[PDB]
């Protein structure tokens, strides 16, 4: 049960006005987050529609420390020999590395400004 | 029957303008409850969406007085022997336990003024 174009639409226009990061923009998107349940493509699929090149680059480098540092202190879900967090992610019988890479990608995204 | 974005997308744009504790904010939150028959999951989402931080801090004190203090007095089919009624309410075979949550959790939020 993957989003539609109209969630996506909804998503970014009740948004448009506020700032990436703001108290409403959070509000909306960890609430898109905890309801559909995508994966990490998905997401990065939300985040292209949503904000441009730059703010996209300075997210992924945010997000890349913060899954560096959570999956280097060691996960309870996580095997490093099988792939990326970001792979894992993309597996639907790893819920725990989705619901990790979920929140490390929403804190990532408040941590803008 | 969960609610999807589009009912919660809704509900927080006719609950903008009014500020919570006005008779528009409790008949609409009064009505949404009533009608999809919400959890304690979905009540926390939806507080999250709509209200700062801060109100929702305010809101979960006067939950846990109110839920105190109706533990102490006495719920019909409520049983300690497994877990709060924070988490009897999430077993969808307690509905007693869930419309008792959902009321005090009305009240709660008429009473922050």
């Known amino acids: ?12 226009q009740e948004v448009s006005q506020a700032a990436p990061g703001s ?3 959070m509000q909306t ?6 309801q559909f349940d995508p994966t990490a493509k998905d997401l990065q699929d939300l985040l292209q529609y949503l904000c441009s090149s730059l703010v996209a680059s300075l997210h992924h480098q945010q997000l890349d420390s913060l899954i ?9 879900g996580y095997n490093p020999l099988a792939g990326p967090l970001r792979v894992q992610a993309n597996n639907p019988q790893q819920q725990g590395l989705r619901r990790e890479y979920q929140q490390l990608w929403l804190a990532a995204f408040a941590a803008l400004p």
Request: aromatic share 6%.
């Open 1 to 12: 049960r993957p989003w539609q174009m109209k969630d996506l639409q909804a998503i970014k």
């Open 23 to 25: 108290p409403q923009f």
């Open 29 to 34: 998107i960890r609430l898109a987050v905890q």
């Open 68 to 76: 560096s540092e959570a999956e280097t202190r060691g996960i309870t």
